Amino acid sequence: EGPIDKLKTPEDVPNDPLPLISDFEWSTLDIDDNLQLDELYKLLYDNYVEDIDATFRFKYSHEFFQWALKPPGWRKDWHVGVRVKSTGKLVAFIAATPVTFKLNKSNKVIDSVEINFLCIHKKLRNKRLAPVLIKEITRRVNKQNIWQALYTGGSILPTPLTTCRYQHRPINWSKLHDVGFSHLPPNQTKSSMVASYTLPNNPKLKGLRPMTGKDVSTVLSLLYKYQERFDIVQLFTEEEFKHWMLGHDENSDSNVVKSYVVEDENGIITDYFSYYLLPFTVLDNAQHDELGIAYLFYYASDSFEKPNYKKRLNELITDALITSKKFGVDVFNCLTCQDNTYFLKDCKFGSGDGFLNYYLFNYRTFPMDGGIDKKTKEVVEDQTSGIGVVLL
Amino acid sequence: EGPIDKLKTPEDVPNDPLPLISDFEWSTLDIDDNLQLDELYKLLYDNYVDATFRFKYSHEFFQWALKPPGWRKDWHVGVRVKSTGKLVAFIAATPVTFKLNKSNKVIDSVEINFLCIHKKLRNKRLAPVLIKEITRRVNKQNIWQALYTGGSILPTPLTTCRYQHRPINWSKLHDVGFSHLPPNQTKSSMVASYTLPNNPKLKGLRPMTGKDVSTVLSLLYKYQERFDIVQLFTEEEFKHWMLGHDENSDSNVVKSYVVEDENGIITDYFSYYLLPFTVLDNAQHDELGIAYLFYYASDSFEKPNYKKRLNELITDALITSKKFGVDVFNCLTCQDNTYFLKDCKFGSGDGFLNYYLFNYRTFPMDGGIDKKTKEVVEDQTSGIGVVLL
Amino acid sequence: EGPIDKLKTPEDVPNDPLPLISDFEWSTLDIDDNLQLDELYKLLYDNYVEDIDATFRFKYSHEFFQWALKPPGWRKDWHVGVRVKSTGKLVAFIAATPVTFKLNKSNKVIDSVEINFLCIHKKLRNKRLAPVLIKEITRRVNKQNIWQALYTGGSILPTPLTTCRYQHRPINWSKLHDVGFSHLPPNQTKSSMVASYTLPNNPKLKGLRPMTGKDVSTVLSLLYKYQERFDIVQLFTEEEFKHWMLGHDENSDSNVVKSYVVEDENGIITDYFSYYLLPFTVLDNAQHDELGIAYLFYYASDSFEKPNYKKRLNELITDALITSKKFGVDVFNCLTCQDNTYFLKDCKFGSGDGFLNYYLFNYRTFPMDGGIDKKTKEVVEDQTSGIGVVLL
């Protein structure tokens, strides 16, 4: 387990951007300039429809971008676009956001970066631009003395850490059906389906309440003890954990990340969970314009050593599902990572067609379980996946 | 193992082509202009080559061979005689990504091919000049290594593989002088010894489609871990090379197949490309259909039925080629090809291929043949895991 | 229990400093050059303000540095600074000092090092230098064949030895109130508070006197017998103990460490205690410029096996509190380590908001009691903490 490249210094890294065919030019984006953020939003809206229904589009708000791209230490220099010289139009983009990972087996902590928002205009798909975008953002971070990067996607590149599968838990089945997200199984009716997904309106766990700034250190310690069971995890400073769990702005309740804690009868935090909101804009449907989507984020529980562990986790996620109902969520998603396969069945998460591959550039690691059978790709129940990180 | 040159930047590279004899001039080709593509075809037909055979290149073949994702017109370098403007030499560079498995190094490079020089200019030793100029053009795009192959004996090759041939229509191969009748044999025995079923044998065998790309790619990646040097692709790239330039039209150049088991899981796959020979001076035939083994991979490499499975795969490849007018099926002694040459009836040819990775030192590699006898060494994995068209 | 890494030789350690973002360069400090020491002082003064009030700054004297960084065996090579190449200004620092620990339960002695004075310029908090500073100081000591290091701070990392809590014992309440250190409780007056903290002007224990170089072997033996009750302790050569208890200069009374012994009629030393002085410079107070602070150091008593142990310890600390009054001390601090929880209540130490985490890099150890409830973080009275070492 360890780095792959012979190891050099920022000095040995080219000082200038890689060359591009004459029709294009690099353009560093300044997302604090609303006109440029507008450009990015448009590029994504039209062209970042990866493995999604043609009728859906990621609906990114200004608040979502603050949260996703501006954690402590973020750099404008790492928001790399490509413009067509003729008109100045934005046609490609790639980002790197700072992150710290830890490989539990070898006890290695690595300051890295997460590479995401890799977007290429649909008319430029045959220009082989992805590898160029990756080389350039990698050059920029190597200059900052960072030598490992995490990249995730459905694309098949060499040596993935592993592969997890998407899961979906219908919250408002009727609407999911009206827009084409969910299908009516063989011997079922819309009525049976809806009935089968009904949930309480109120969370069940006593002491469950929204997390606040004062809970940051306690939750962090709880997550740290808990995540020892995964192969790869994330470490945060308190300022970073605060940003990712509560939002960019400390004095305004986040509409993007929802974080909850459970404190027992004596006031001690024993469990916590978090999820983020990222809706889809829906096209060509006469009644619906938006589809509320939640994504399971980080969580942790006291009970991992006790015998009621599985039951407790399923109770935690059930309350997460219940709370999402007050935020317009229509489907609650998660992957087969962390200990997620312990609650998929009882909580009614169905397997989706999508898969996620994880790549840790410039680093060899032992194989990792992805929560699914290596050949069948079917969910394997109650198994701990080596993936303990969640990427937005 | 690693680069050779001291390493510089595109800036340190001469901005202009190096002057040629005054009689000629550099001329970048634009293959999207049919008139220029026609010029290239004529130059190749006449000067790129047995005497009675000529590579028959179609427009479709050129799209496939020269226009994969990221191809650059600036890398289609021709030379014109100033007097008449006639095209007399050419050289190309196409983007490709290699990975050296032993050292786990990934290198974005380029494949240098279609190096053609008019027969009357063979004494001006233009090849080195063509290589230097194409090399200069790619160095400018910050690429510093290149793969070049051929029968030519240049300084230090990765290794050397040998050609193999598997008669499909022996009678015709004999009619045109490709195949010879062995000492104590008859045309009748030969023909009988090469007959093959008319239908593929493996269950679940079908043509590959766009939807199989990621799955096949993962299968090839796991499989090719056994070779020393391999190729990596983006999904667009793999799709182009396995299915053709045009996504909505079945290719007549590359034939790709997958085998999915009782559960719909792809367990094997193979591909081959078609490149006929125009046949000159034969009263019966004008063309000789030729297939070349491309990339393949199998589930069974860890199992004990591996060798039998591979031979079953190739045998079905041979059978499918019969419907595309193939007269001979060729392949080199690279990859794990030596595991099926004998049982599948591939005979050694006189041709050999040398591989050169300019500006890069690598450990020796197996070529699938004995270092001194140059004879096929059965069931041996070659270090060469890349196939060049 | 034991080392974590596979174990290598100095030989397997990289011979040259780690690469740095090209803007900076490693610069070994020579604190014997007053100009360089002045640089270190300034860097600290401006940027080493973590976990303290904005209006306070650590007031480091030349004497304090001699004591803290120059014990027997100190190495200049372990005073690692970072300079911005453009101007040569000092922007970061980290030090390693030799120290020997003993793990009482497993009876393992380990020559190690204490990593401290990790300081980064406020404007580079986003360059993520700490990990790089640690890696580089760790490389230098690994070269000297030392493979374990102790690091402490408020920062949270996975698996600390334990966590202790800060305690404060107002000496001059009125001043602590004026400068905002202490707050006036709900139904209290400045007058009640002051009255509640008054102390005698003279120590009460008979035979109490200042320790001298002569007493070293006897005091050391007393501490050794005594500290057998903690999980991790420190071992000293007589030379090291002399330095840490009496100061860098043998022929001049120290203004940084105050050590005292209690002997009976026949010169038998029965108890001893020590504490060090580290003031805060006070900013923006129309009245005060400095705030005298004392920190409980090492101590030991005869009575640990006897029934008057608790009462005796309390008598000891009470005399420490009284003696600090002649050195301008305004608050007397300590952590909940050692047997400190035996005297916090009766001696009037109040719990602060600060906590200290301890980390022994490259070594797994059994859990240790930090003197606080593992769940409420509140002081747990009269208990022995596994922490028997004090870090300055």
Q: Do the beta carbons of residue B89 and residue B78 sit within 8 Å? A: yes
Record the tokens describing residue B177, joined without a space: 């002088």
Q: Which chains touch C (3 or more CB pairs under 8 A)?
A: A
Record the tokens describing residue B74, joined without a space: 């600036």
Q: DSSP assignment, residue C298?
A: E
- Nearest-CA residue of chain A relative to B219? A156
Residue of C103, C222, C344, C392 marked catalytic: C392
Q: In whole angstroms, what separates CA A63 from the centre of its chain?
A: 16
Which long-range contacts (C-beta less than 8 Å, at least 24 apart) are formed by B173-177? B173/B288, B173/B327, B173/B328, B175/B282, B175/B284, B175/B285, B176/B52, B176/B279, B176/B282, B176/B285, B176/B288, B177/B50, B177/B52
Which long-range contacts (C-beta less than 8 Å, at least 24 apart) are formed by C180-186? C180/C53, C180/C55, C181/C53, C181/C291, C181/C330, C181/C331, C182/C331
What residues of chain A, 139 to 158, have a C-beta less than 8 Å from chain C?
143-145
Q: In whole angstroms, what separates CA C194 from the centre of its chain?
A: 28
CA separation for the pair C341, B126 (Å, rounded): 90
- Residues sharing a CB contact under 8 Å with residue C172, sequence separation 6 or more, in sequence order: C292, C329, C330, C331
Of residues B131, B114, B166, B385, the one with CA closest to residue B289: B166
Q: DSSP assignment, residue B384?
A: B
Chain B nearest CA to A75, separation (Å)? 26
Q: Rounded to the nearest 5 degrees, what angle is found at the Cα of A75, between the Cα atoms of A74 and A77?
A: 160
Element housing C321 (H / E): helix C309-324
Chain B nearest CA to A255, separation (Å)? 36
Number of CB atoms found within 10 A of residue A285's CB:
13
* DSSP per-residue codes, C188-199: --HHHHHHHH--
- Residues sharing a CB contact under 8 Å with residue C389, sequence separation 6 or more, in sequence order: C101, C150, C230, C232, C233, C234, C337
Q: Does A7 touch chain B (CB under 8 A)?
A: no
CA separation for the pair A327, C224 (Å, rounded): 62
CA separation for the pair B264, B247 (Å, rounded): 23
CATH numeric code, B1-144: 3.40.630.30
Q: Does B69 touch chain A (CB under 8 A)?
A: yes
Q: Do the beta carbons of residue A85 and residue A25 sit within 8 Å? A: yes
Give me the residues paired with residue C113 across strands.
C98, C149
Q: Do the beta carbons of residue C113 and residue C146 sit within 8 Å? A: yes
Convert B298-324 to b/e letters by CB count within 10 Å (16 or more is b): bbbbeeeebbebbbbbbbbbbbbbbee
Convert A101-116 to b/e letters by CB count within 10 Å (16 or more is b): bbbbeeebebbbbbbb
Convert B54-92 to b/e letters by CB count within 10 Å (16 or more is b): bebbeebbbbbbbbbbbbbebbbbbbbbeeeeebbbbbb
For tokens 């053609």, name the residue: B116
Q: DSSP assignment, residue B19?
A: P
CA separation for the pair C59, B229 (Å, rounded): 63
CB–CB contact A109 C132 (8 Å): no
CA separation for the pair A157, A126 (Å, rounded): 17
| Half-sphere exposure for C129 (CA within 13 Å, toward CB) | 26
E-only strand ranges, A64-222:
79-84, 90-103, 108-120, 149-153, 162-170, 208-210
Resolution limit, Å: 2.5
The type of residue at C146 is: I
CA separation for the pair C80, C67 (Å, rounded): 18
Same fold, A1-147 and A148-392: yes
Q: DSSP assignment, residue B195?
A: -
- Residues sharing a CB contact under 8 Å with residue C63, sequence separation 6 or more, in sequence order: C247, C248, C254, C255, C256
List residues forming the annotated binding site of A: 118-120, 126-130
Phi and psi torsions of A200, nearest 5°: -60, 165
Within A250-385, residue ranges assigned H as helices are 309-324
Phi and psi torsions of C164, nearest 5°: -120, 165
For tokens 């069931």, name the residue: B379
Of residues A259, A324, A338, the one with CA closest to residue A293: A324
CB–CB contact A10 C20 (8 Å): yes
Q: Rounded to the nearest 5 degrees, what angle is found at the Cα of B274, between the Cα atoms of B272 and B280?
A: 145
Whether chains B and C touch (3+ CB pairs under 8 A) is answered by no
CA separation for the pair B369, B160 (Å, rounded): 8
The residues of B annotated with a catalytic role in the active site are 389
Q: DSSP assignment, residue B17?
A: P
Give me the residues paired with residue C27 across strands.
C81
Q: Does B235 touch chain A (CB under 8 A)?
A: yes
Breaks (C-N over 2.5 A) in chain C follow: none
Q: Do the beta carbons of residue C375 and residue C382 sit within 8 Å? A: no
**What is the DSSP pairing of strand B229-232 with strand A269-277?**
unpaired
Number of CB atoms found within 10 A of residue C2's CB:
10
Chain A nearest CA to C385, separation (Å)? 20
- DSSP helix/strand/coil, A112: strand
CB–CB contact A268 C4 (8 Å): no
Q: Does A18 touch chain B (CB under 8 A)?
A: yes
Q: In whole angstroms, what separates CA B20 from the centre of its chain?
A: 30
CA separation for the pair B253, B245 (Å, rounded): 10
Chain A hits for C51, Cβ within 8 Å: none
Q: Do the beta carbons of residue C79 and residue C28 sit within 8 Å? A: yes
- Nearest-CA residue of chain A relative to C364? A107
Rg (alpha carbons) of chain C, rounded to whole number:
21
Record the tokens describing residue C121, joined without a space: 């310029």
The type of residue at C297 is: F
CB–CB contact A8 C21 (8 Å): no
Query: Distances in Å between the alpha carbon of A43 and those of A32, A37, A118, B115, C23?
Result: 17, 10, 11, 41, 34
CA separation for the pair A56, A324 (Å, rounded): 21
Query: What are the extents of the domains in chain C?
Result: 1-147, 148-392
CB–CB contact B217 A156 (8 Å): yes
- Residues sharing a CB contact under 8 Å with residue A75, sequence separation 6 or more, in sequence order: A96, A98, A144
Choose, out of A76, A103, A104, A107, the residue to mutate when testing the contact with C (most C CBs < 10 Å).
A107
CA separation for the pair C391, C95 (Å, rounded): 13
Phi and psi torsions of A170, nearest 5°: -55, 130
Chain B nearest CA to A351, separation (Å)? 18
Phi and psi torsions of A204, nearest 5°: -85, -35
Give me the residues paired with residue A232 across strands.
A103, A387
So what CATH class is C148-392?
A: alpha beta
- Residues sharing a CB contact under 8 Å with residue B243, sequence separation 6 or more, in sequence order: B208, B209, B210, B251, B254, B256
Element housing C163 (H / E): strand C163-170
**What is the DSSP pairing of strand C331-335 with strand C293-301?**
parallel
The type of residue at A6 is: K
For tokens 């994969």, name the residue: B68
Query: Distances in Å between the alpha carbon of B160 and those of A10, A19, B224, B368?
Result: 39, 35, 19, 8
Q: Do the beta carbons of residue C135 and residue A217 sit within 8 Å? A: no
Taking every pair of C-alpha atoms in chain A, what is the biggest distance, in angstroms? 67
CB–CB contact B72 A21 (8 Å): yes
CA separation for the pair B31, C206 (Å, rounded): 105
Q: Does C375 touch chain A (CB under 8 A)?
A: yes
Kindly report the length of chain A: 392
Q: Do the beta carbons of residue A356 and residue A335 sit within 8 Å? A: yes
For tokens 């980080």, name the residue: A298
Element housing B352 (H / E): strand B347-358
| B265 annotated ligand-binding residue | no
- Nearest-CA residue of chain A relative to C17? A9
The type of residue at C7 is: L
Nearest to A144 among C21, C158, C376 (CB): C21
- Residues sharing a CB contact under 8 Å with residue C96, sequence separation 6 or more, in sequence order: C75, C78, C113, C114, C115, C137, C140, C141, C149
Convert C119-152 to b/e letters by CB count within 10 Å (16 or more is b): bbbeebeebbbbebbbebbbbbbbebebbbbbbb
Q: Does C7 touch chain A (CB under 8 A)?
A: no
CA separation for the pair A339, A381 (Å, rounded): 9
Q: Does A109 touch chain C (CB under 8 A)?
A: yes
Record the tokens describing residue B249, joined without a space: 């039209």
So what CATH class is B145-388?
A: alpha beta
CB–CB contact B234 A131 (8 Å): yes
CA separation for the pair A129, B171 (Å, rounded): 49
CA separation for the pair C242, B227 (Å, rounded): 66
Number of CB atoms found within 10 A of residue C286's CB:
5
| B66 annotated ligand-binding residue | no
The type of residue at B149 is: T
CA separation for the pair A325, B323 (Å, rounded): 60
Convert B94-129 to b/e letters by CB count within 10 Å (16 or more is b): bbbbbbbbeeebebbbbbbbbbbbbeebeebebbeb
Q: Rounded to the nearest 5 degrees, what angle is found at the Cα of B358, between the Cα atoms of B352 and B363?
A: 75
| C75 annotated ligand-binding residue | no
Record the tokens describing residue A12, joined without a space: 């040995």
CA separation for the pair A237, C142 (Å, rounded): 27
Element housing C37 (H / E): helix C34-47
CA separation for the pair A390, A297 (Å, rounded): 6
CA separation for the pair C30, C35 (Å, rounded): 9
Q: Do the beta carbons of residue B85 and residue B61 sit within 8 Å? A: no
Within chain A, residue ranges assigned H as helices are 34-47, 62-69, 129-142, 173-178, 190-197, 216-226, 238-246, 309-324
Number of CB atoms found within 10 A of residue C303's CB:
18
SS3 string of A337-354?
CCCHHHCCCCCCCEEEEE
CA separation for the pair B254, B268 (Å, rounded): 17
CA separation for the pair C169, C172 (Å, rounded): 9
* DSSP per-residue codes, C208-230: EEE--GGGHHHHHHHHHHHGGGS
- DSSP helix/strand/coil, B55: strand
Within A304-367, residue ranges assigned H as helices are 309-324
Q: Do the beta carbons of residue B382 and residue B333 sit within 8 Å? A: yes
Record the tokens describing residue B125, joined without a space: 């030793």
CA separation for the pair C233, C299 (Å, rounded): 12
Kindly report the length of chain B: 389
Q: Is the dihedral of CA B229, B233, B237, B241 positive or negative?
A: positive
Give me the residues paired with residue A150 across strands.
A114, A360
CA separation for the pair A273, C153 (Å, rounded): 28
SS3 string of C12-35?
HCCCCCCCCCCCEEEEECCCCCHH
Record the tokens describing residue C13, joined without a space: 């350690």
Q: DSSP assignment, residue B98?
A: E
Of residues A272, A256, A266, the one with CA closest to residue A205: A272
Chain C hits for A268, Cβ within 8 Å: 375-376
Q: Does A309 touch chain C (CB under 8 A)?
A: no
Instruction: Among 3.50.50.60, 2.60.40.420, 3.30.1370.60, 3.40.630.30, name the CATH number for the domain at A1-147.
Output: 3.40.630.30
Whether chains B and A touch (3+ CB pairs under 8 A) is answered by yes
Kindly report the length of chain C: 392
Question: Helices A34-47 and A62-69, interaxial angle, to 10°?
Answer: 90
